[PDB]
């Protein structure tokens, strides 16, 4: 909020990642690194020295306590374990500190490498496969001059097809160039930097002038691949790696189940690898023994690519079940891989999730909340109440009546439950009208309660149907629901012009039947009326069919089953009178007077089903 603004992103860089990680300290000294594989010792339970879960360079465990010991209480704010690397605070700082494996060899990053695009292969025009042997060195590529004497650059060969090449060394000094042929992966890094992207970028732009076809595509890129870089200017040897980064320990953490089955993690073991492959190696260097155990390990060192992905490009390494040990680059990657689901779709708290059984008794604008989930549902605004008006006092001792189960909750809960908007959602979130809100009801049960009318929107039928009692939290989130998100705030799918909301086909039957007609029941001849409740009466009277059509008064516009403005039975006489049946209604008229009889010719039941309407909507 405000403090942040906008996120740039570029190739990271050792020397730049050499700005964080290390944390010099007024021991006067210099702390960053790690070196040696580790979790805590078994017996004690805390990390070690280096140690992948360091209690020093990384920080605390028991909060404000130097590994050196002699450290209790807190208030200190600079402590540096006099004699240890414990610099306490809260045990929170620990989460905000990284280290690095410090690759002895300049390993390169898989994320350029076999990369679908393979940016690295592209630049220095090192064919993926070609450069794919610069690493896993099985063909060291002729590197820079290194061929004045007739051999050629960018050119490759395995040590086996090399020893004989540089064999003339015995005497022939055709070695004036005195530049060794490619040696291994580091070569790529040498050509990565030093090379002049400038004086070459435009050196391609004008090449573009020339024929531009299937080859152009490459060029083209190259331009971008270099221009995209010129944007910064930074190092392509940043794709190659000096030294790693490394995530903090508390988050990959080692886990607790007592008994000895202490799960630990699945990237610290990457490390576990990786650190060892790094140290043991160096620990060759010195003794400088044969490269068969050193240069061969450099591949077992570049093999750190697995750390970054068990899975691109070597066979994956195996897990407890030969699984692609979820790489550090396998945590926020799939829809089920943290990332969105761990942010765009967190699960979250405060709400209900109970079977939505049929319960059409209540109205629509409001839902019916059962008690099984009526307590959680507002405890914060409940505990505060009942104290707040002094009922009790304090927490965990005033909410005494909660778990005490008295009444006074239950009513007070209701007292603070009406006018408290709630929203709800079906197992499927479906559409926006799918998470509608409604005024929760104070009912008791393990099922929901809600208004049929909408189902369909949620479509929540009622056969083992299950949904969820969501709830606003801020106040004005109640607004999201107060007069913006609530069942009343919808009369037609934002989908179409259509008002999906409608009495179920069961009700439409109650409508249809009431508008039908039974041959048998056709009584009430001349049973006309002021068309008021008179016919209702006339129906609370029975002796009439709910479809026995009488002709009932009502000069107001009466939509008639059939055309009613047509000469059907004329009886135009004098002293007024022009008297046509108009089938479903029969005024007599008056030359001097006008129309008044009207005579809507339909069952009282009809007028009945067409009288509770005007009132229903707005009387």
């Amino acid at each position: 909020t405000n403090q942040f603004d906008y996120v740039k992103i570029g190739l990271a860089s050792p020397e730049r990642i050499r700005q964080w990680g290390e944390r010099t300290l007024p021991n006067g000294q210099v702390v960053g690194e790690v070196t040696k594989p580790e979790t805590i010792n078994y017996r004690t339970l805390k990390p070690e020295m280096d140690g992948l879960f360091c209690e020093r360079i990384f920080g605390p465990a028991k909060d404000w306590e130097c590994h050196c010991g002699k450290y209790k209480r807190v208030r200190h704010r600079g402590i540096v374990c006099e004699r240890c690397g414990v610099e306490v605070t809260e045990s929170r700082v620990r989460r905000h500190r990284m280290g690095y494996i410090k690759l002895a060899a300049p390993v390169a990053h898989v994320w350029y490498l076999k990369g679908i695009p393979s940016y690295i292969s592209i630049l220095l025009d090192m064919p993926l496969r070609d450069v794919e042997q610069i690493v896993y060195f099985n063909s060291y590529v002729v590197l820079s001059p290194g061929n004045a004497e007739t051999l050629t650059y960018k050119q490759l060969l395995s040590e086996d097809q090399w020893l004989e090449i540089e064999d003339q060394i015995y005497s022939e000094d055709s070695q004036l160039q005195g530049v060794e042929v490619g040696i291994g992966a580091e070569a790529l890094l040498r050509l990565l930097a030093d090379i002049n992207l400038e004086q070459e970028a435009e050196s391609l732009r004008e090449e573009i002038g020339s024929a531009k076809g299937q080859k152009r595509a490459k060029l083209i890129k190259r331009l971008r691949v270099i221009d995209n870089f010129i944007a910064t200017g930074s190092k392509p040897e940043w794709m190659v790696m000096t030294v790693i980064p490394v995530i903090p320990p508390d988050l990959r953490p080692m886990v607790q189940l007592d008994g000895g089955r202490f799960a630990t993690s699945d990237l610290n073991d990457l490390y576990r690898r990786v650190i060892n492959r790094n140290n043991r190696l160096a620990r060759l260097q010195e003794i400088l023994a044969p490269e068969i155990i050193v240069r061969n390990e450099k591949r077992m060192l570049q093999e750190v690519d697995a750390l970054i992905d068990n899975g691109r490009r070597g066979r994956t390494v195996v897990g407890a079940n030969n699984r692609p040990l979820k790489s550090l680059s396998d945590i926020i990657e799939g829809k089920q891989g943290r990332f969105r689901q761990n942010l765009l779709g967190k699960r979250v708290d405060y709400s209900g999730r109970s079977v939505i059984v049929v319960g059409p008794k209540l109205k629509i604008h409001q839902c019916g909340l059962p008690r099984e989930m009526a307590i959680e549902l507002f405890q914060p605004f409940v505990i505060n109440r009942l104290i707040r008006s002094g009922m009790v006092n304090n927490i965990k001792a005033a909410k005494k009546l909660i778990s005490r189960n008295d009444p006074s909750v239950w009513d007070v809960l209701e007292e603070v439950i009406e006018g408290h908007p709630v929203m709800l959602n079906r197992a499927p979130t479906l559409h926006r009208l799918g998470i509608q809100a409604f005024e929760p009801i104070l009912v008791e049960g393990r099922a929901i309660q809600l208004h049929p009318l909408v189902c369909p929107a949620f479509n929540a039928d009622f056969d083992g149907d299950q949904m969820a009692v969501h709830v606003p939290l801020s106040l004005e989130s109640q607004a999201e629901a107060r007069l913006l998100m609530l069942a009343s705030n919808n009369i037609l799918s934002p989908a179409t012009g259509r008002p999906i909301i409608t009495p179920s086909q069961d009700m439409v039957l109650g409508a249809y039947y009431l508008t039908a007609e039974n041959p048998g029941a056709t009584k009430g001849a001349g049973k006309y009326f002021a068309s008021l409740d008179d016919v209702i009466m006339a129906f609370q009277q029975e002796q009439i069919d709910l479809h026995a059509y009488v002709y009932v008064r009502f000069d107001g516009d009466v939509e008639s089953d059939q055309p009613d403005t047509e000469p059907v039975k004329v009886t135009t006489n004098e002293d007024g009178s022009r008297t046509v049946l108009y089938k479903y209604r029969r005024v007599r008229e008056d030359a001097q007077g006008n129309v008044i009889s009207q005579y809507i010719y339909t069952t009282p039941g009809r007028v009945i089903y067409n009288k509770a309407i005007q009132e229903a909507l707005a009387s």
Partner: protein
């Protein structure tokens, strides 16, 4: 009618089968062993095997909640082709449990069961195979029951190559690697092998190719190609048993089709055959042989425990064989004894896998007796061996007229893992080649009567006799009217009359699986309709008081006996006192004895007043917390008869499937309270004392011994009511047979939690409020809220028996409870054919509509439901039942009106009506003008509803999805670790789960706020979330988001992955990099 012999024990004898062959069979075959040198030998004896009585049983086994077993044993033969040192003695080999009474293997803990698999039983087949244009191709393929795949093909041009475990070489040295006899192909192929004479590009040189080309000439590269190289290679694909099979069958088949004489008792492979392929494919290339079937039994095939517990035992032992080969030949061998070089432990383990952990067990779901039918015998092709569950794309899923009579279509989980559950023909059986049976009953061109033979095969396939479906108007003694009957040739169903057929039903239902038969008259209900409904009863809940159905199709009674819940004599008797706890031809001392000696027997102790002892079961926690206690059924001194069920368990009275009860059902859209789907029922149900689950479920708890400084349970610690602490017992323990209700207290954990870094208030407050307590803690067990259950047992134990204990842990606390609990709202109750129901509300026994006879009814429905569900007959029963109920009428009659071959059903109904009402006296329960209706005088005040509406008796059956275990709602709590977000694994503190599909529908109106919160502070921000807590109880305007952090978390790993971000203000001096870390 005819008797249908025991579903269940497919497995059993097949199971049995195994040991009454297998043990040896494999192991003896790799029988002999010896020092690498060869002198000091040792063998598996491969004969006169032995094992002793493992006194552990199943209940005593479940007693230590451990695995049943039989210590497993064998001797060697001897020591050496060095001087014939014997030093024979038995050597224990591999103990482990096995088949249990209720068709389980009571392993540790529990009694899972194994599911059969299909798979492409072996053989060598061959793609017809087609293209981008049309012009087509030919290709061949080979695979045994276990091993590589020999695969072949055609580059447009009567060419070949050979691909195996390589998929990298268009390599074809046919006959140029084995049997390179002078032009042996024009001796085995002879007909158009490569246009009769090879092609250009193919040369067939072998001098250095046989065992030396396509083996190193591109294969397996870099060394030189030693002729031996490929030699010992291609043994090493093949020749070499222990790395390849057919599978005795495999041959059976393989040969049999390609029919070539190779009987030859070899479960590995020859040359010639191969050729016979090779041709054969080209034979089909020249269109002389038909394309293989690759979809159903044609290539697919069951298998099952025997081999499941056989393939791996050879493997598990193969492992051993390596090791021993060292161990035996590790050093001196003079006296080192069979007994010495034998590490059984492997085998036992790995098998301990293969029950215990092979992804294959399930937990044998016993939610319902029936279930454990089905689950005897579904089967799949999920299998190590099986398919993906998403690369096994389609035909895989479909059906196949083989399925007709071989497996039921009404069986389908309709899930992403459905269409993979062989129903197992209601009658099938199988053979040593796994292939199942499905009878084809002969009709001598007009005359069946089942007097003819056969009628018992069509195993996995057919006969190319156009073939008689199940039923058709079968006249008295057979003569099989149908002028011109339709009947099935092969996957097809032409018409023809008594000439040319002869195989026909056993019975009119050879395509079902345990529950798809429940449907009393599926004859009248759509198939698309019949499925999940037929799978409802499949997993029905039980019900305290059982009741046969009403209405009758009756197939099942027996099946109930197959289940085991109901007990038949083992032998015989006429019961003495049949005490509920102890029925007895047990030590009776009486005539349950004597027929318990009817015509007595011997390994059965008739030796003395017979003696058939066995204890009934009370309410025990099923593997699914289901429960059932059977019932002492047969009263005393009342004769029995061998092997006839006399115990009334879960759901039979008497050997029938107690599912539901029988209920009047007027369908009726009344005042709503139901308008799909939506059940309504009358309070009576509760007062009826029926619809009463009961459940009982573990709770347990344990104590650690902290390396932090051990802790126990207590018998209390503070703030204990004895009001708490009372119905407690003498360690802290909780008294059994004691009522509990809600946040109740089990028993007294005592935990460690010192205060070294005394919290800021701490030392003082403690000493300040005025008292010096101590944090010896106690997370003792508090039973969940709403736990109004009397406690009902406990199993429990500590160091002393040797706690068989998860180590690091001190003493078991497991104990638990049930409760009688009547049905409520949202109960997924329904029927057994296209159903799924729940209920609003229940209701005053009076307001609900009643009858002119004067009784009130007890289940509305809606009425529209059924016509829509296109499931009609539910009527039927309604009806039929009606009867039943009016004149106590039983039916138990197979479905499908076949009598006369038309709507006789009808005929039935109105009939049994007719007389019933005729003799019902009132004669109102039926109206001539209401042929199937009734009247409905019973409005709100009991008017006359109007149209005479039909009602009657249905079989309402409830399910589990009880709101109780399916309830859920909570207000925050523990977040995760990693995201540190609370977490919903459907627990008491279960994440209100969450759906971004809604966060993709919650912005359609936007207004952030809810979102803003709606993420934040209930996800990332600590101090947010809390901030909240306060705000409200702090009369404060809950502020403003935190900022998320998980974000930051995601950012962290990224930054390490190689990211950078200046995230920052910019109104700041040249922006910068706001510390958002």
């Amino acid at each position: 009618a005819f008797l249908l012999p025991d579903l269940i024990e497919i497995q059993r004898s097949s199971f049995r089968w195994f040991l009454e062959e297998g043990l040896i069979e494999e192991l003896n075959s790799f029988s002999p062993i010896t020092d690498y040198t060869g002198k000091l030998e040792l063998h598996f004896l491969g004969h006169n095997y032995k094992l002793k009585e493992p006194k552990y049983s199943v209940e005593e086994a479940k007693r230590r909640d451990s695995t049943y077993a039989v210590q497993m044993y064998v001797p060697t033969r001897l020591l050496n082709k060095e001087t014939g040192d014997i030093k024979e003695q038995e050597v224990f080999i591999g103990d482990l449990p096995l088949m249990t009474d209720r068709g389980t293997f009571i392993i540790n803990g529990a009694e899972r069961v194994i599911v059969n698999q299909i798979v492409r039983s072996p053989g060598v087949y061959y793609k017809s195979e087609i293209d981008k244009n049309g012009r087509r191709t030919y290709s061949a393929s080979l695979i045994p029951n276990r091993g590589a795949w020999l695969k072949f093909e055609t580059d447009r041009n009567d060419l070949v190559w050979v691909r195996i475990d390589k998929t990298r070489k268009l390599s074809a040295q046919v006959l140029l690697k084995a049997l390179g006899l002078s032009d042996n192909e024009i001796f085995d192929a002879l007909r158009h092998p490569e246009y009769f004479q090879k092609t250009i590009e193919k040369e067939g040189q072998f001098s250095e190719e046989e065992a030396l080309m396509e083996l190193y000439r591109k294969l397996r590269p870099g060394e030189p190609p030693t002729v031996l190289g490929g030699q010992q290679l291609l043994d090493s694909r093949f020749f070499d048993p222990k790395r390849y099979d057919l599978g005795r069958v495999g041959r059976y088949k393989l040969n049999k089709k390609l029919r070539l004489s190779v009987p030859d008792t070899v479960r590995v492979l020859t040359s010639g055959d191969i050729l016979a392929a090779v041709d054969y494919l080209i034979n089909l290339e020249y269109d002389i042989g038909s394309i293989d079937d690759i979809d159903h039994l044609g290539n697919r095939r069951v298998r099952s425990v025997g081999e499941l517990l056989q393939n791996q035992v050879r493997v598990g032992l193969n492992r051993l064989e390596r090791i021993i080969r060292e161990r035996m030949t590790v050093s001196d061998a003079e006296v080192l004894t069979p007994a010495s070089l034998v590490n059984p432990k492997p085998l036992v383990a790995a098998i301990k896998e293969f029950f215990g952990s092979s992804q294959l067990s399930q937990f044998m779901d016993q939610t319902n007796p029936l279930a454990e039918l089905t689950h005897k015998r579904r089967l799949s092709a999920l299998g190590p061996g099986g398919l993906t569950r998403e690369r096994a794309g389609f035909a895989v899923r479909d059906i196949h007229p083989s399925h007709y009579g071989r497996i039921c279509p009404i069986e389908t989980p309709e899930g992403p893992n459905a269409g993979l559950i062989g129903s197992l023909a209601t009658h099938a059986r199988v053979n040593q080649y796994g292939f199942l049976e499905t009878p084809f009953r002969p009709v001598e061109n007009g005359r069946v009567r089942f007097d003819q033979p056969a009628a018992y095969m069509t195993a996995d396939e057919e006969d190319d006799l156009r073939v008689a479906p199940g039923d058709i108007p079968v006249d008295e003694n057979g003569y099989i009217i149908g002028p011109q009957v339709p009947v099935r040739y092969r996957q097809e169903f032409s018409t023809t009359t008594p000439e040319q057929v002869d195989y026909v039903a056993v019975s009119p239902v050879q395509i079902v699986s345990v529950a798809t038969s429940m449907i009393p008259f599926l004859e009248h209900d759509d198939a698309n309709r019949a499925l999940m409904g037929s799978n409802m009863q499949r997993q029905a809940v039980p019900l305290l008081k059982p009741e046969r159905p009403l209405v009758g199709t009756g197939l099942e009674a027996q099946g109930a006996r197959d289940s085991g819940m109901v007990i038949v004599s083992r032998t015989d008797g006429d019961v003495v006192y049949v005490d509920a706890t102890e029925i007895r031809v047990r030590v009776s001392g009486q005539l349950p004895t004597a027929s318990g000696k009817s015509t007595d027997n011997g390994q059965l102790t008739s030796q003395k007043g017979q003696e058939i002892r066995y204890t009934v079961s009370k309410y025990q926690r099923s593997n699914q917390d289901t429960c059932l206690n059977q019932k002492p059924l047969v009263r005393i001194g009342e004769r029995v008869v061998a092997g006839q069920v006399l115990a009334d368990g879960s759901s039979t009275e008497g050997g029938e499937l107690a599912l539901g009860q029988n209920i009047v059902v007027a369908y009726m859209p009344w005042e709503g309270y139901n308008y799909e789907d939506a059940i309504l029922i009358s309070e009576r149900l509760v007062q009826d004392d029926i619809y009463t689950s009961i459940h009982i479920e573990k709770y347990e708890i344990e104590a650690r011994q902290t390396k932090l400084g051990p802790e126990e349970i207590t018998r209390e610690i503070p703030n204990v009511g004895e009001d708490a602490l009372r119905q407690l017992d003498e360690q802290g323990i909780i008294r059994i047979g004691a009522w509990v209700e809600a946040g109740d207290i089990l028993v007294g954990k005592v935990t460690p939690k010192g205060e070294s870094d005394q919290p800021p208030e701490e030392k003082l407050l403690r000493a300040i409020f005025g008292e010096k307590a101590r944090d010896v803690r106690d997370n003792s067990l508090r039973v969940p809220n709403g736990e109004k259950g009397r406690v009902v047992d406990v199993r429990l134990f500590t160091r002393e028996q040797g706690d068989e204990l998860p180590p690091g842990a001190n003493m078991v606390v497991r104990v638990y409870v049930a409760q009688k609990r009547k049905i409520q709202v949202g109960d997924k109750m329904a029927g057994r054919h296209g159903n799924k129901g729940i209920i609003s509300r229940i209701l005053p026994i009076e307001d609900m509509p009643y009858l002119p006879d004067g009784s009130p009814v007890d289940i509305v429905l809606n009425p529209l439901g059924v016509p829509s569900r296109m499931n009609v007959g539910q009527v039927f029963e309604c009806l039929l039942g009606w009867a039943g109920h009016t004149l106590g009428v039983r039916f138990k009659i197979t479905p499908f009106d076949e009598m006369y071959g038309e709507e006789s059903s009808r005929r039935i109904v109105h009939g049994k009506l007719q007389e019933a009402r005729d003799e019902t006296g009132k004669d109102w329960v039926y109206n001539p003008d209401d042929p199937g209706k009734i009247m409905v005088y019973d409005g709100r005040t009991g008017e006359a509803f109007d149209r005479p509406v039909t009602i009657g008796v249905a079989y309402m059956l409830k399910l589990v999805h009880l709101v109780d275990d399916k309830i859920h709602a909570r207000s925050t709590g523990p977040y995760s670790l990693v995201t540190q977000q609370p977490l919903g694994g459907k627990a008491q503190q279960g994440g209100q789960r969450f759906g971004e599909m809604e966060v993709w529908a919650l912005e359609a109106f936007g207004a952030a706020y809810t979102l803003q919160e709606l993420l934040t502070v209930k996800s990332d921000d600590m101090q947010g979330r809390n901030e909240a807590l306060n705000a409200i109880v702090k009369g404060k305007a809950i502020p403003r988001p935190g900022t998320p952090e998980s974000f930051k978390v995601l950012m962290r790993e990224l930054q390490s992955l190689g990211l950078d971000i200046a995230v920052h203000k910019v109104e700041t001096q040249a922006d910068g990099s706001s510390l958002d870390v």
